[PDB]
């Protein structure tokens, strides 16, 4: 119980070893597994868990008919033991809402979940089993936050919300909370045209995030946040390796400060570990649909304009459906540098498989290795 501080570096990421996989749908065909979607995994100083927004019913249960819809009264944020299924006798409900984020600060944990009608949406920050503060919709058009863990330096945890339009401008704000209470907030500042759903990781006393420009960008907007002076900055990843889905095909040259054109109005949540030369990016392997997954070594892609991959490792085949990705790290593991971990939501059902009236998923997660481990597909 001492507020954790980001005291370390990223380690040399050369391979990726498995961390978790819950075989949820296959268990769920004969067990009281809940219908979820949008998952993430986060740790507290003695336990790591899987998280997801449930749709308040079991898969084989009749109320699963209609779970393609992703915002309603019945969704609850749930946590469940590492690599377990979200089972009705297991999952802990955290809060009631349809968008979230949780991070343990060092002393106790904070979780935010938004509920509401689309014109009257509300965020309540619970810190450590009780609610502490509420935020109401500043721009009355679906208040949303990230769906991955937040990161905390010294009691201060930066987290990002966006309320507005998806198809063109919205008001996103950075918020800093210490023990549930608000300390400040800021408008977005930078060249990043539009940001929403942000994968954040903390590394050497600052936190960095990749988000989604749903409006124009096929390259990813970036926000680098300084927690101590409570300041931030946005831009795009400079690469030709385009990572949003759908994208255009891979260009020879890229755009550092403006969004990359072609495909527009649409996008997926994703992560990156941009640590200079030690930079690995992830993307779908299919230009048009969430099918497949891969990790690629693209040294200096945040700054280098014509950055192309020097090493790779495939996680999911193009034949197998994937879904949202994002980053987490165990800040409490013993070491000199943090080990980069990540997850991929493996979606299953509607829209792509129209012969079931439900939509649910699995998860698979992976952390860095120093060795050049052999690749497999999951």
């Amino acid at each position: 119980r001492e507020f954790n501080n980001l005291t370390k570096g990223l380690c040399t990421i050369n391979s990726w070893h498995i961390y978790g996989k819950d075989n949820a749908v296959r268990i769920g065909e004969d067990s009281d597994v809940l219908v979820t979607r949008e998952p993430y995994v986060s740790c507290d100083p003695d336990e790591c868990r899987f998280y997801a927004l449930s749709q308040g019913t079991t898969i084989r249960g009749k109320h699963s008919n209609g779970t393609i819809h992703d915002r309603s009264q019945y969704r609850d944020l749930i946590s469940w033991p590492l690599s377990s299924p979200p089972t009705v006798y297991n999952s802990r409900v955290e809060c009631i809402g349809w968008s979230s984020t949780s991070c343990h600060d060092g002393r106790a944990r904070m979780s935010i979940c938004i509920s509401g009608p689309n014109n009257n949406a509300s965020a309540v920050i619970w810190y450590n089993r009780r609610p502490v503060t509420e935020i109401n919709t500043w721009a009355r058009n679906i208040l949303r936050t990230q769906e991955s863990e937040c990161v905390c330096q010294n009691g201060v945890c930066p987290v990002v919300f966006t309320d507005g339009s998806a198809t063109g401008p919205a008001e996103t704000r950075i918020y800093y909370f210490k023990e549930g209470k608000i300390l400040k907030w800021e408008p977005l500042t930078g060249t990043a045209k539009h940001i929403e759903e942000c994968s954040c990781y903390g590394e050497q006393a600052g936190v960095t995030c990749t988000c989604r420009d749903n409006w124009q960008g096929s390259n990813r907007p970036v926000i680098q946040i300084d927690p101590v002076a409570m300041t931030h900055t946005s831009q795009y990843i400079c690469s030709p390796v385009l990572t949003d889905n759908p994208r255009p095909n891979d260009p020879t040259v890229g755009k550092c400060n403006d969004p990359y054109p072609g495909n527009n109005n649409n996008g997926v949540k994703g992560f990156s570990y941009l640590d200079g030369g030690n930079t690995w990016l992830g993307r779908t392997i299919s230009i048009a649909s969430r099918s497949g997954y891969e990790m690629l070594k693209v040294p200096n892609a945040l700054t280098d304009d014509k950055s192309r991959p020097t090493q790779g490792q495939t996680i999911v085949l193009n034949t197998d459906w994937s879904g949202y990705s994002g980053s987490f790290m165990d800040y409490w593991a013993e070491g000199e540098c943090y080990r980069a971990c990540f997850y991929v939501e493996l979606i299953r059902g509607r829209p792509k498989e129209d012969k079931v009236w439900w939509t649910s998923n699995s998860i698979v997660s992976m952390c860095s290795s120093t060795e050049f481990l052999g690749q497999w597909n999951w």
Partner: antibody
Amino acid sequence: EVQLQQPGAELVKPGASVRMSCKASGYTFTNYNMYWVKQSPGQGLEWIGIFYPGNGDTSYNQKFKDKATLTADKSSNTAYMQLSSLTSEDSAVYYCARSGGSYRYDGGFDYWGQGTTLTVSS
Amino acid sequence: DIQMTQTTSSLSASLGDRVTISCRASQDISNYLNWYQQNPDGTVKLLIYYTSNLHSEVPSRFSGSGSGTDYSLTISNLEQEDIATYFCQQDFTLPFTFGGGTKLEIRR
């Protein structure tokens, strides 16, 4: 020996529904996206959609999304396409084609079908 | 759309000479352009993909080059049967858009 065999015509009536076929020959059907494209009597070529046969994904052109659904019967390596509510304005020729890319929407439509003529009549 | 353009649908040649055709894109399409020849009756073949690369069975004489927005095919030793309607198209992003086409006519 890439044969995308397609009939020379279909003669139809206004408003009904016809169903196209493109019999893929001499390659691995499960492994390449099939592409459907339209050529109306005095206009350039309009692509309608894609169908990847070994996973089942489909993607449609903005306007076409209403008129065409893409299908395939993998045992007979037949790609197919149902256009419903045909009329004068869609008396044209339709093609199937496959990309050089095996799942990639890249490298261009490398082998093309015969082209089947759609004539609506009373 | 992504505007694909081919200026005018006709050109002549007195059968023997080197001829050039040019496609314009509405945005910098990195270099994802391809060239298609429709035979006098039906049959469309592929000749060039990604601006310069020839397909499997091609005449040694067909060239392609360009950058950004404007991309040209050159046919050198115009052996008559090569007279038809050529089309450019892109696949930088989908929808795929094709040009209007240019028929070639001969004069001898």
